[PDB]
Design a protein around this ligand. Structure first.
Ligand SMILES: Nc1nc2c(ncn2[C@@H]2O[C@H](COP(=O)(O)OP(=O)(O)O)[C@@H](O)[C@H]2O)c(=O)[nH]1
Ligand SMILES: [Mn+2]
Ligand SMILES: [Mn+2]
Ligand code: NA
Length: 620
């Protein structure tokens, strides 16, 4: 209905039909078209034709370049103001702040950012009205999970960015089939704008529309809305990924008895023909993708990848923790990727891949720090800043948080069960981060409650994945600091509660450190495929092997228990050393952090594990 002619957007639809949409989808699309005032509405179909045409259009406009060396690969270079997540501009809206974060004693929380509904309405009104003028609003129906799976969750993302459309086609299952699967069901409402209505009010930098000053990534869990303004960077604009499948989903999971986690899922097969699945939570840019598609150095071992970033898991009636990967692609850090470090990623990204903020070679290929491939004499390099570049120059040729965005189905070791709606049974959970000192290569938690404490106590050097600079060691509990959808204390309680579930077969919990350094700042452990030697030890421990010795922080490998054949130059004593002074300091730091940041919401069990660790260290 309407008394005039501005409410019904039918005449502005350039693909699809508002009449063909499910009723509630139409209302969502049209309501936001009324607000944002796009010139056109394009309902995505997910087809190869749509995708190729959109890419060519972006190429026309100078928004992306085709990489002529490869099969259907593309390179986007962004405004340098829009390169990573911004935690301080990422918020969750609830009636009560304590539902979203524990109230920190110190007054500033490091476990999320809350915004009142009043303040968010004002922020929304200062951003979205008219924001799509002169642009197309693309409507992206997407599934987090295989099309038609009983455990998939569907969303609709509205965006004015073709780059977002193309990247969502890779990272989710997208298009008409999803609308058909959705029918009259519920869907997560996702609204995104780059925040640059036409005619442009401000200079366009590097043909990359964005609004840094007004960037705001908001989540409204009771209304089932995600609303993101001003950034095109995938972590901020691919709304099915961090926003939905971690922040919204972790709160749903709390309410419904499951888990949504920042974890890879991999399957590993040993030389005796046994296969086990493991999950691992490491912070952004701290080794998940490389572990998930590892090429093991140990003969007779094989790793297969289920997912590299997000896991949705629950204990089933048989007691097994079963996990699914709700994503359809990998959005991986590019620098460091080489045939030696991640040969499976190199094979995956050679076709149908979008690269962002990497360098370009004159024969139409890609380049980045650590790529470890010599170029022919005469071949030149254009940096991610679109300037000619030479290896002798002061700055990197690729941004440190540059990315590939690639279909998971193309991974040569994609696991045969990666789309099974039954999920895969997790037998070990691994925590870890970047710790240049003090923390040994691997240890095993003493119990479930100890393992939840180990997750809670995680710390890691800052990376380029968000706004934190330098290499300051930060708390990042469960690798979820940027991603909790609700109060972290409550999340710890939820984890603890799993132990008391009927027939629960609780996975073993481990903590790793690939990143300990010697006195000269060189890594003590080579990592990458050599991490298979650590996974071997974990595998044996899951099977019940007596290959561990007790220490104050947990179980570690016995002398000679790790296979170090071919690594005679590793300094094992240094790499496994546990210093009373370091750990006295560590436990004091963890105590103060949990007291300040979790406070009244810290479960008794976790405080008890803290007291126990302090006491074990005191007996050293
Ligand atoms: N030294 C070392 N670096 C690693 C290892 N695994 C990954 N990296 C590097 O760390 C960065 C992030 O790796 P990635 O696996 O993409 O981490 P993710 O963001 O957690 O998925 C890349 O530059 C990798 O080359 C490892 O075992 N050792
Ligand atoms: Mn991640
Ligand atoms: Mn990754
Ligand atoms: Na650009």
């Amino acid at each position: 209905p309407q008394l005039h002619n501005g409410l019904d957007f039918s005449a502005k639809v350039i693909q699809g039909s508002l009449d063909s949409l499910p009723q509630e989808v139409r209302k969502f699309v049209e309501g936001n078209a009324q607000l944002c005032q796009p010139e056109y509405i394009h309902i995505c179909d997910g087809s190869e034709e749509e995708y190729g045409r959109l890419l060519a259009h972006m190429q026309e406009e100078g928004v992306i370049r085709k990489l002529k060396k490869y099969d259907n690969c593309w390179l986007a270079l962004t405004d340098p103001r829009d390169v990573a997540r911004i935690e301080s501009k990422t918020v969750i809206i609830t009636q009560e702040q304590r539902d979203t974060v524990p109230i920190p004693k110190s007054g500033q929380s490091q476990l999320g950012r809350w915004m009142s509904e009043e303040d968010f309405e004002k922020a929304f009104n200062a951003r979205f009205p008219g924001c799509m003028k002169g642009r197309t609003m693309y409507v992206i129906p997407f599934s987090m999970g295989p099309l038609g799976s009983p455990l998939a969750k569907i969303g609709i993302e509205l965006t004015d960015s073709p780059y977002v459309v193309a990247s969502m086609r890779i990272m989710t299952r997208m298009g008409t089939s999803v609308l058909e699967a959705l029918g009259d069901g519920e869907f997560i409402k996702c609204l995104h704008s780059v925040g640059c209505p036409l005619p442009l009010k401000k200079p366009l930098v590097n043909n990359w529309a964005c609004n840094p000053e007004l960037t705001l990534i908001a989540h409204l869990p009771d209304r089932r809305e995600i609303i993101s303004f001003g950034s095109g960077y995938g972590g901020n604009s691919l709304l099915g990924k961090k926003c939905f499948a971690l922040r919204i989903a972790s709160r749903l999971a709390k309410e419904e008895g499951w888990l949504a986690e920042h974890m890879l899922i991999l399957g590993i097969t040993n030389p005796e023909g046994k296969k086990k699945y493991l999950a691992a939570a490491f912070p952004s840019a701290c080794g998940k993708t490389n572990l998930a598609m590892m090429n093991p150095t140990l003969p007779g071992w094989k790793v297969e990848c289920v997912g590299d970033d997000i896991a949705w898991m629950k204990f089933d009636a048989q007691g097994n923790l079963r996990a699914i990967n709700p994503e359809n692609g990998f959005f991986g850090v590019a620098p460091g990727t080489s045939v030696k470090t991640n040969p499976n990623a190199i094979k995956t990204i050679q076709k149908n891949t979008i690269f962002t903020n990497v360098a370009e070679t004159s024969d139409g290929g890609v380049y980045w720090e650590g790529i470890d491939e010599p170029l022919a004499p005469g071949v030149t390099i254009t940096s991610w800043k679109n300037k000619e570049w030479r290896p002798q120059d002061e700055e990197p040729c690729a941004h440190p948080n540059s990315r590939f965005c690639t279909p998971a189905s193309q991974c040569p070791i994609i696991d045969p069960a990666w789309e099974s709606p039954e999920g895969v049974p997790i037998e070990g959970i691994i925590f870890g981060g970047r710790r240049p000192a003090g923390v040994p290569l691997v240890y095993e938690a003493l119990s479930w409650q100890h393992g939840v404490f180990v997750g809670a106590a995680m710390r890691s050097e800052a990376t380029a994945a968000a706004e934190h600079k330098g290499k300051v060691i930060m708390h990042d509990p469960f690798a979820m600091r940027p991603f909790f959808g609700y109060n972290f204390g409550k999340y710890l309680a939820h984890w603890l509660s799993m132990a008391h579930r009927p027939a629960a077969k609780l996975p073993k919990i481990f903590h790793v450190n690939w990143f300990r350094k010697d006195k000269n700042g060189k890594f003590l452990w080579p990592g990458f495929g050599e991490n298979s030697r650590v996974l071997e030890w974990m595998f044996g421990r899951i099977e019940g092997e007596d290959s561990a010795k007790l220490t104050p922080i947990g179980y570690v490998p016995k002398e000679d228990a790790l296979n170090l054949k071919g690594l005679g130059d590793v300094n094992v004593e240094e790499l496994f050393g546990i210093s009373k002074e370091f750990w006295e300091k560590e436990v004091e730091e963890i105590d103060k952090y949990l007291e300040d940041q979790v406070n009244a919401d810290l479960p008794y069990e976790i405080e008890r594990e803290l007291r126990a660790l302090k006491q074990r260290i005191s007996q050293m």
